[PDB]
Amino acid sequence: PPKKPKKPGDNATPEKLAAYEKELAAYEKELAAY
């Protein structure tokens, strides 16, 4: 099963938000594939 990325709170900078978006998209892609 694909990894679920930890939803970032206030302690997050735009780069980690973008990273989260990539990992979240990846999560959706891999979950779709599964």
PDB file of all heavy atoms in Angstrom:
ATOM      1  N   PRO A   1       0.821  -1.217   0.000  1.00  0.00           N
ATOM      2  CA  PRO A   1       0.000   0.000   0.000  1.00  0.00           C
ATOM      3  C   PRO A   1       0.855   1.267   0.000  1.00  0.00           C
ATOM      4  O   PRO A   1       1.898   1.317   0.657  1.00  0.00           O
ATOM      5  CB  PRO A   1      -0.804  -0.104   1.303  1.00  0.00           C
ATOM      6  CG  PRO A   1      -0.807  -1.556   1.628  1.00  0.00           C
ATOM      7  CD  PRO A   1       0.525  -2.079   1.158  1.00  0.00           C
ATOM      8  N   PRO A   2       0.426   2.300  -0.740  1.00  0.00           N
ATOM      9  CA  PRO A   2       1.188   3.544  -0.868  1.00  0.00           C
ATOM     10  C   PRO A   2       1.145   4.376   0.411  1.00  0.00           C
ATOM     11  O   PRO A   2       0.169   4.322   1.166  1.00  0.00           O
ATOM     12  CB  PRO A   2       0.499   4.277  -2.020  1.00  0.00           C
ATOM     13  CG  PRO A   2      -0.892   3.733  -2.065  1.00  0.00           C
ATOM     14  CD  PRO A   2      -0.839   2.336  -1.495  1.00  0.00           C
ATOM     15  N   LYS A   3       2.204   5.144   0.645  1.00  0.00           N
ATOM     16  CA  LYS A   3       2.348   5.893   1.885  1.00  0.00           C
ATOM     17  C   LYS A   3       1.403   7.092   1.924  1.00  0.00           C
ATOM     18  O   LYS A   3       1.213   7.782   0.922  1.00  0.00           O
ATOM     19  CB  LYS A   3       3.797   6.369   2.064  1.00  0.00           C
ATOM     20  CG  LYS A   3       4.212   7.466   1.093  1.00  0.00           C
ATOM     21  CD  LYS A   3       5.621   7.961   1.378  1.00  0.00           C
ATOM     22  CE  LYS A   3       5.943   9.233   0.602  1.00  0.00           C
ATOM     23  NZ  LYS A   3       5.948   9.023  -0.871  1.00  0.00           N
ATOM     24  N   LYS A   4       0.814   7.330   3.086  1.00  0.00           N
ATOM     25  CA  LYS A   4      -0.044   8.491   3.288  1.00  0.00           C
ATOM     26  C   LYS A   4       0.790   9.636   3.856  1.00  0.00           C
ATOM     27  O   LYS A   4       1.296   9.538   4.975  1.00  0.00           O
ATOM     28  CB  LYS A   4      -1.187   8.153   4.257  1.00  0.00           C
ATOM     29  CG  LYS A   4      -2.203   9.278   4.444  1.00  0.00           C
ATOM     30  CD  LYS A   4      -3.257   8.897   5.476  1.00  0.00           C
ATOM     31  CE  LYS A   4      -4.378   9.924   5.552  1.00  0.00           C
ATOM     32  NZ  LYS A   4      -5.208   9.938   4.319  1.00  0.00           N
ATOM     33  N   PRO A   5       0.979  10.717   3.092  1.00  0.00           N
ATOM     34  CA  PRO A   5       1.772  11.859   3.547  1.00  0.00           C
ATOM     35  C   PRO A   5       1.103  12.606   4.696  1.00  0.00           C
ATOM     36  O   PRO A   5      -0.114  12.796   4.707  1.00  0.00           O
ATOM     37  CB  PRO A   5       1.878  12.750   2.310  1.00  0.00           C
ATOM     38  CG  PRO A   5       0.715  12.369   1.455  1.00  0.00           C
ATOM     39  CD  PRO A   5       0.447  10.914   1.731  1.00  0.00           C
ATOM     40  N   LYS A   6       1.910  13.016   5.663  1.00  0.00           N
ATOM     41  CA  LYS A   6       1.421  13.733   6.833  1.00  0.00           C
ATOM     42  C   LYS A   6       0.992  15.147   6.452  1.00  0.00           C
ATOM     43  O   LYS A   6       1.803  15.935   5.959  1.00  0.00           O
ATOM     44  CB  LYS A   6       2.511  13.795   7.909  1.00  0.00           C
ATOM     45  CG  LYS A   6       2.932  12.429   8.437  1.00  0.00           C
ATOM     46  CD  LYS A   6       4.033  12.540   9.486  1.00  0.00           C
ATOM     47  CE  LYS A   6       5.328  13.103   8.908  1.00  0.00           C
ATOM     48  NZ  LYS A   6       5.897  12.231   7.845  1.00  0.00           N
ATOM     49  N   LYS A   7      -0.284  15.456   6.670  1.00  0.00           N
ATOM     50  CA  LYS A   7      -0.822  16.777   6.350  1.00  0.00           C
ATOM     51  C   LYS A   7      -0.130  17.848   7.194  1.00  0.00           C
ATOM     52  O   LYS A   7      -0.198  17.808   8.423  1.00  0.00           O
ATOM     53  CB  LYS A   7      -2.340  16.798   6.593  1.00  0.00           C
ATOM     54  CG  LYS A   7      -3.028  18.082   6.142  1.00  0.00           C
ATOM     55  CD  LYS A   7      -4.537  18.009   6.349  1.00  0.00           C
ATOM     56  CE  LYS A   7      -5.168  16.859   5.567  1.00  0.00           C
ATOM     57  NZ  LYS A   7      -4.910  16.957   4.104  1.00  0.00           N
ATOM     58  N   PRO A   8       0.554  18.812   6.551  1.00  0.00           N
ATOM     59  CA  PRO A   8       1.317  19.838   7.261  1.00  0.00           C
ATOM     60  C   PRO A   8       0.419  20.934   7.823  1.00  0.00           C
ATOM     61  O   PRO A   8      -0.571  21.323   7.199  1.00  0.00           O
ATOM     62  CB  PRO A   8       2.239  20.397   6.177  1.00  0.00           C
ATOM     63  CG  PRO A   8       1.479  20.227   4.909  1.00  0.00           C
ATOM     64  CD  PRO A   8       0.628  18.992   5.084  1.00  0.00           C
ATOM     65  N   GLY A   9       0.750  21.409   9.012  1.00  0.00           N
ATOM     66  CA  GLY A   9      -0.026  22.467   9.624  1.00  0.00           C
ATOM     67  C   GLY A   9       0.604  23.828   9.415  1.00  0.00           C
ATOM     68  O   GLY A   9       1.105  24.129   8.332  1.00  0.00           O
ATOM     69  N   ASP A  10       0.589  24.643  10.458  1.00  0.00           N
ATOM     70  CA  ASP A  10       1.134  25.997  10.387  1.00  0.00           C
ATOM     71  C   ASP A  10       2.654  25.970  10.295  1.00  0.00           C
ATOM     72  O   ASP A  10       3.274  26.876   9.732  1.00  0.00           O
ATOM     73  CB  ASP A  10       0.693  26.818  11.601  1.00  0.00           C
ATOM     74  CG  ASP A  10       1.193  28.244  11.549  1.00  0.00           C
ATOM     75  OD1 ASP A  10       0.748  29.004  10.668  1.00  0.00           O
ATOM     76  OD2 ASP A  10       2.037  28.612  12.393  1.00  0.00           O
ATOM     77  N   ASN A  11       3.257  24.919  10.832  1.00  0.00           N
ATOM     78  CA  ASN A  11       4.708  24.769  10.796  1.00  0.00           C
ATOM     79  C   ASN A  11       5.151  24.184   9.454  1.00  0.00           C
ATOM     80  O   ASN A  11       5.812  23.143   9.395  1.00  0.00           O
ATOM     81  CB  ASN A  11       5.192  23.888  11.957  1.00  0.00           C
ATOM     82  CG  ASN A  11       4.938  24.522  13.312  1.00  0.00           C
ATOM     83  OD1 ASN A  11       4.942  25.745  13.448  1.00  0.00           O
ATOM     84  ND2 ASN A  11       4.719  23.698  14.324  1.00  0.00           N
ATOM     85  N   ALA A  12       4.769  24.857   8.375  1.00  0.00           N
ATOM     86  CA  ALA A  12       5.125  24.430   7.036  1.00  0.00           C
ATOM     87  C   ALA A  12       5.403  25.633   6.147  1.00  0.00           C
ATOM     88  O   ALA A  12       4.696  26.642   6.214  1.00  0.00           O
ATOM     89  CB  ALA A  12       4.013  23.587   6.436  1.00  0.00           C
ATOM     90  N   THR A  13       6.434  25.520   5.327  1.00  0.00           N
ATOM     91  CA  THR A  13       6.779  26.559   4.375  1.00  0.00           C
ATOM     92  C   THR A  13       6.327  26.148   2.972  1.00  0.00           C
ATOM     93  O   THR A  13       6.149  24.955   2.730  1.00  0.00           O
ATOM     94  CB  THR A  13       8.299  26.821   4.397  1.00  0.00           C
ATOM     95  OG1 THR A  13       9.012  25.590   4.212  1.00  0.00           O
ATOM     96  CG2 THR A  13       8.713  27.452   5.716  1.00  0.00           C
ATOM     97  N   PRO A  14       6.104  27.102   2.040  1.00  0.00           N
ATOM     98  CA  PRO A  14       5.577  26.796   0.697  1.00  0.00           C
ATOM     99  C   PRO A  14       6.242  25.591   0.024  1.00  0.00           C
ATOM    100  O   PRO A  14       5.578  24.832  -0.687  1.00  0.00           O
ATOM    101  CB  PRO A  14       5.852  28.074  -0.093  1.00  0.00           C
ATOM    102  CG  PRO A  14       5.818  29.161   0.928  1.00  0.00           C
ATOM    103  CD  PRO A  14       6.315  28.554   2.224  1.00  0.00           C
ATOM    104  N   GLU A  15       7.537  25.402   0.262  1.00  0.00           N
ATOM    105  CA  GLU A  15       8.269  24.290  -0.345  1.00  0.00           C
ATOM    106  C   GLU A  15       7.741  22.946   0.165  1.00  0.00           C
ATOM    107  O   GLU A  15       7.627  21.986  -0.601  1.00  0.00           O
ATOM    108  CB  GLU A  15       9.772  24.413  -0.072  1.00  0.00           C
ATOM    109  CG  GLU A  15      10.620  23.450  -0.886  1.00  0.00           C
ATOM    110  CD  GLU A  15      10.532  23.720  -2.374  1.00  0.00           C
ATOM    111  OE1 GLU A  15      11.341  24.517  -2.888  1.00  0.00           O
ATOM    112  OE2 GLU A  15       9.651  23.141  -3.038  1.00  0.00           O
ATOM    113  N   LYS A  16       7.391  22.879   1.447  1.00  0.00           N
ATOM    114  CA  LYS A  16       6.859  21.645   2.014  1.00  0.00           C
ATOM    115  C   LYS A  16       5.394  21.468   1.627  1.00  0.00           C
ATOM    116  O   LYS A  16       4.880  20.353   1.608  1.00  0.00           O
ATOM    117  CB  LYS A  16       7.027  21.613   3.536  1.00  0.00           C
ATOM    118  CG  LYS A  16       6.560  20.309   4.165  1.00  0.00           C
ATOM    119  CD  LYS A  16       7.108  20.128   5.571  1.00  0.00           C
ATOM    120  CE  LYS A  16       6.634  21.225   6.513  1.00  0.00           C
ATOM    121  NZ  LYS A  16       7.144  21.032   7.896  1.00  0.00           N
ATOM    122  N   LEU A  17       4.727  22.569   1.309  1.00  0.00           N
ATOM    123  CA  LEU A  17       3.359  22.503   0.809  1.00  0.00           C
ATOM    124  C   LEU A  17       3.360  21.938  -0.602  1.00  0.00           C
ATOM    125  O   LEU A  17       2.538  21.093  -0.946  1.00  0.00           O
ATOM    126  CB  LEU A  17       2.694  23.882   0.815  1.00  0.00           C
ATOM    127  CG  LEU A  17       2.066  24.334   2.140  1.00  0.00           C
ATOM    128  CD1 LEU A  17       0.990  23.362   2.598  1.00  0.00           C
ATOM    129  CD2 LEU A  17       3.113  24.503   3.220  1.00  0.00           C
ATOM    130  N   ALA A  18       4.309  22.406  -1.405  1.00  0.00           N
ATOM    131  CA  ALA A  18       4.496  21.902  -2.756  1.00  0.00           C
ATOM    132  C   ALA A  18       4.909  20.438  -2.715  1.00  0.00           C
ATOM    133  O   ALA A  18       4.431  19.615  -3.499  1.00  0.00           O
ATOM    134  CB  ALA A  18       5.543  22.729  -3.481  1.00  0.00           C
ATOM    135  N   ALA A  19       5.796  20.121  -1.777  1.00  0.00           N
ATOM    136  CA  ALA A  19       6.220  18.748  -1.556  1.00  0.00           C
ATOM    137  C   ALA A  19       5.032  17.883  -1.171  1.00  0.00           C
ATOM    138  O   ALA A  19       4.872  16.773  -1.674  1.00  0.00           O
ATOM    139  CB  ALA A  19       7.287  18.688  -0.477  1.00  0.00           C
ATOM    140  N   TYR A  20       4.194  18.411  -0.285  1.00  0.00           N
ATOM    141  CA  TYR A  20       2.992  17.711   0.144  1.00  0.00           C
ATOM    142  C   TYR A  20       2.044  17.509  -1.030  1.00  0.00           C
ATOM    143  O   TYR A  20       1.420  16.464  -1.147  1.00  0.00           O
ATOM    144  CB  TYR A  20       2.281  18.473   1.269  1.00  0.00           C
ATOM    145  CG  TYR A  20       1.009  17.797   1.754  1.00  0.00           C
ATOM    146  CD1 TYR A  20       1.067  16.622   2.493  1.00  0.00           C
ATOM    147  CD2 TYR A  20      -0.246  18.334   1.478  1.00  0.00           C
ATOM    148  CE1 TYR A  20      -0.085  16.002   2.945  1.00  0.00           C
ATOM    149  CE2 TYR A  20      -1.402  17.718   1.928  1.00  0.00           C
ATOM    150  CZ  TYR A  20      -1.314  16.554   2.659  1.00  0.00           C
ATOM    151  OH  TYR A  20      -2.463  15.944   3.118  1.00  0.00           O
ATOM    152  N   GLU A  21       1.945  18.511  -1.895  1.00  0.00           N
ATOM    153  CA  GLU A  21       1.111  18.405  -3.088  1.00  0.00           C
ATOM    154  C   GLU A  21       1.626  17.300  -4.006  1.00  0.00           C
ATOM    155  O   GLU A  21       0.841  16.528  -4.554  1.00  0.00           O
ATOM    156  CB  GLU A  21       1.058  19.736  -3.847  1.00  0.00           C
ATOM    157  CG  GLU A  21       0.112  20.768  -3.241  1.00  0.00           C
ATOM    158  CD  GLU A  21       0.000  22.014  -4.094  1.00  0.00           C
ATOM    159  OE1 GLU A  21      -0.733  21.980  -5.108  1.00  0.00           O
ATOM    160  OE2 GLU A  21       0.644  23.033  -3.763  1.00  0.00           O
ATOM    161  N   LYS A  22       2.945  17.218  -4.158  1.00  0.00           N
ATOM    162  CA  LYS A  22       3.549  16.186  -4.991  1.00  0.00           C
ATOM    163  C   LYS A  22       3.323  14.803  -4.389  1.00  0.00           C
ATOM    164  O   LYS A  22       2.932  13.873  -5.092  1.00  0.00           O
ATOM    165  CB  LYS A  22       5.053  16.444  -5.179  1.00  0.00           C
ATOM    166  CG  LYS A  22       5.732  15.435  -6.102  1.00  0.00           C
ATOM    167  CD  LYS A  22       7.215  15.731  -6.297  1.00  0.00           C
ATOM    168  CE  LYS A  22       8.093  15.084  -5.228  1.00  0.00           C
ATOM    169  NZ  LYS A  22       7.744  15.519  -3.850  1.00  0.00           N
ATOM    170  N   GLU A  23       3.558  14.674  -3.092  1.00  0.00           N
ATOM    171  CA  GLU A  23       3.385  13.401  -2.409  1.00  0.00           C
ATOM    172  C   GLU A  23       1.914  13.003  -2.337  1.00  0.00           C
ATOM    173  O   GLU A  23       1.583  11.820  -2.357  1.00  0.00           O
ATOM    174  CB  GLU A  23       3.979  13.465  -1.003  1.00  0.00           C
ATOM    175  CG  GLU A  23       5.475  13.735  -0.996  1.00  0.00           C
ATOM    176  CD  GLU A  23       6.241  12.759  -1.859  1.00  0.00           C
ATOM    177  OE1 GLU A  23       6.445  11.606  -1.428  1.00  0.00           O
ATOM    178  OE2 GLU A  23       6.645  13.141  -2.978  1.00  0.00           O
ATOM    179  N   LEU A  24       1.038  13.994  -2.250  1.00  0.00           N
ATOM    180  CA  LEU A  24      -0.396  13.744  -2.216  1.00  0.00           C
ATOM    181  C   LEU A  24      -0.882  13.289  -3.589  1.00  0.00           C
ATOM    182  O   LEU A  24      -1.668  12.347  -3.699  1.00  0.00           O
ATOM    183  CB  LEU A  24      -1.151  15.002  -1.768  1.00  0.00           C
ATOM    184  CG  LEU A  24      -2.668  14.845  -1.646  1.00  0.00           C
ATOM    185  CD1 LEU A  24      -3.030  13.853  -0.552  1.00  0.00           C
ATOM    186  CD2 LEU A  24      -3.323  16.191  -1.383  1.00  0.00           C
ATOM    187  N   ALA A  25      -0.397  13.954  -4.632  1.00  0.00           N
ATOM    188  CA  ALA A  25      -0.706  13.566  -5.998  1.00  0.00           C
ATOM    189  C   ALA A  25      -0.174  12.170  -6.277  1.00  0.00           C
ATOM    190  O   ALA A  25      -0.849  11.342  -6.889  1.00  0.00           O
ATOM    191  CB  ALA A  25      -0.110  14.563  -6.974  1.00  0.00           C
ATOM    192  N   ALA A  26       1.040  11.922  -5.810  1.00  0.00           N
ATOM    193  CA  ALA A  26       1.658  10.610  -5.925  1.00  0.00           C
ATOM    194  C   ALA A  26       0.836   9.567  -5.181  1.00  0.00           C
ATOM    195  O   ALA A  26       0.632   8.459  -5.672  1.00  0.00           O
ATOM    196  CB  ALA A  26       3.082  10.646  -5.395  1.00  0.00           C
ATOM    197  N   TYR A  27       0.358   9.937  -4.000  1.00  0.00           N
ATOM    198  CA  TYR A  27      -0.496   9.066  -3.204  1.00  0.00           C
ATOM    199  C   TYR A  27      -1.765   8.708  -3.967  1.00  0.00           C
ATOM    200  O   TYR A  27      -2.146   7.542  -4.029  1.00  0.00           O
ATOM    201  CB  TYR A  27      -0.847   9.727  -1.862  1.00  0.00           C
ATOM    202  CG  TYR A  27      -1.905   8.983  -1.066  1.00  0.00           C
ATOM    203  CD1 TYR A  27      -1.608   7.786  -0.424  1.00  0.00           C
ATOM    204  CD2 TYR A  27      -3.206   9.470  -0.970  1.00  0.00           C
ATOM    205  CE1 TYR A  27      -2.572   7.096   0.290  1.00  0.00           C
ATOM    206  CE2 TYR A  27      -4.175   8.785  -0.261  1.00  0.00           C
ATOM    207  CZ  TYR A  27      -3.853   7.601   0.366  1.00  0.00           C
ATOM    208  OH  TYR A  27      -4.820   6.917   1.067  1.00  0.00           O
ATOM    209  N   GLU A  28      -2.407   9.709  -4.560  1.00  0.00           N
ATOM    210  CA  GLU A  28      -3.621   9.478  -5.337  1.00  0.00           C
ATOM    211  C   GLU A  28      -3.327   8.604  -6.554  1.00  0.00           C
ATOM    212  O   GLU A  28      -4.110   7.714  -6.885  1.00  0.00           O
ATOM    213  CB  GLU A  28      -4.250  10.808  -5.787  1.00  0.00           C
ATOM    214  CG  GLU A  28      -4.799  11.658  -4.645  1.00  0.00           C
ATOM    215  CD  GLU A  28      -5.372  12.971  -5.132  1.00  0.00           C
ATOM    216  OE1 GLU A  28      -6.537  12.982  -5.582  1.00  0.00           O
ATOM    217  OE2 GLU A  28      -4.666  13.998  -5.070  1.00  0.00           O
ATOM    218  N   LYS A  29      -2.193   8.853  -7.202  1.00  0.00           N
ATOM    219  CA  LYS A  29      -1.795   8.101  -8.389  1.00  0.00           C
ATOM    220  C   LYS A  29      -1.547   6.631  -8.046  1.00  0.00           C
ATOM    221  O   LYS A  29      -2.059   5.727  -8.717  1.00  0.00           O
ATOM    222  CB  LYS A  29      -0.538   8.732  -9.007  1.00  0.00           C
ATOM    223  CG  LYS A  29      -0.059   8.060 -10.285  1.00  0.00           C
ATOM    224  CD  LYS A  29       1.235   8.686 -10.780  1.00  0.00           C
ATOM    225  CE  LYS A  29       1.668   8.106 -12.121  1.00  0.00           C
ATOM    226  NZ  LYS A  29       0.676   8.382 -13.193  1.00  0.00           N
ATOM    227  N   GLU A  30      -0.784   6.396  -6.986  1.00  0.00           N
ATOM    228  CA  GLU A  30      -0.452   5.042  -6.566  1.00  0.00           C
ATOM    229  C   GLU A  30      -1.672   4.324  -5.990  1.00  0.00           C
ATOM    230  O   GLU A  30      -1.857   3.128  -6.209  1.00  0.00           O
ATOM    231  CB  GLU A  30       0.685   5.068  -5.547  1.00  0.00           C
ATOM    232  CG  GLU A  30       2.026   5.470  -6.144  1.00  0.00           C
ATOM    233  CD  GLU A  30       3.114   5.613  -5.099  1.00  0.00           C
ATOM    234  OE1 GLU A  30       3.447   4.603  -4.441  1.00  0.00           O
ATOM    235  OE2 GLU A  30       3.645   6.731  -4.925  1.00  0.00           O
ATOM    236  N   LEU A  31      -2.508   5.056  -5.261  1.00  0.00           N
ATOM    237  CA  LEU A  31      -3.738   4.487  -4.716  1.00  0.00           C
ATOM    238  C   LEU A  31      -4.694   4.117  -5.846  1.00  0.00           C
ATOM    239  O   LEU A  31      -5.406   3.114  -5.766  1.00  0.00           O
ATOM    240  CB  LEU A  31      -4.411   5.468  -3.747  1.00  0.00           C
ATOM    241  CG  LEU A  31      -5.626   4.914  -2.995  1.00  0.00           C
ATOM    242  CD1 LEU A  31      -5.209   3.825  -2.016  1.00  0.00           C
ATOM    243  CD2 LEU A  31      -6.357   6.029  -2.269  1.00  0.00           C
ATOM    244  N   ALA A  32      -4.700   4.924  -6.905  1.00  0.00           N
ATOM    245  CA  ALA A  32      -5.497   4.627  -8.087  1.00  0.00           C
ATOM    246  C   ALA A  32      -4.973   3.376  -8.777  1.00  0.00           C
ATOM    247  O   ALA A  32      -5.745   2.511  -9.188  1.00  0.00           O
ATOM    248  CB  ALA A  32      -5.492   5.805  -9.047  1.00  0.00           C
ATOM    249  N   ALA A  33      -3.651   3.287  -8.887  1.00  0.00           N
ATOM    250  CA  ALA A  33      -3.003   2.129  -9.490  1.00  0.00           C
ATOM    251  C   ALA A  33      -3.274   0.858  -8.687  1.00  0.00           C
ATOM    252  O   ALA A  33      -3.441  -0.222  -9.256  1.00  0.00           O
ATOM    253  CB  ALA A  33      -1.509   2.371  -9.615  1.00  0.00           C
ATOM    254  N   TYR A  34      -3.306   0.990  -7.366  1.00  0.00           N
ATOM    255  CA  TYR A  34      -3.579  -0.144  -6.490  1.00  0.00           C
ATOM    256  C   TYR A  34      -5.042  -0.561  -6.611  1.00  0.00           C
ATOM    257  O   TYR A  34      -5.348  -1.706  -6.941  1.00  0.00           O
ATOM    258  CB  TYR A  34      -3.236   0.203  -5.033  1.00  0.00           C
ATOM    259  CG  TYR A  34      -3.265  -0.993  -4.088  1.00  0.00           C
ATOM    260  CD1 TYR A  34      -2.093  -1.658  -3.731  1.00  0.00           C
ATOM    261  CD2 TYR A  34      -4.465  -1.456  -3.552  1.00  0.00           C
ATOM    262  CE1 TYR A  34      -2.120  -2.744  -2.872  1.00  0.00           C
ATOM    263  CE2 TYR A  34      -4.494  -2.540  -2.693  1.00  0.00           C
ATOM    264  CZ  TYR A  34      -3.321  -3.178  -2.359  1.00  0.00           C
ATOM    265  OH  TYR A  34      -3.348  -4.258  -1.507  1.00  0.00           O
TER     266      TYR A  34
END
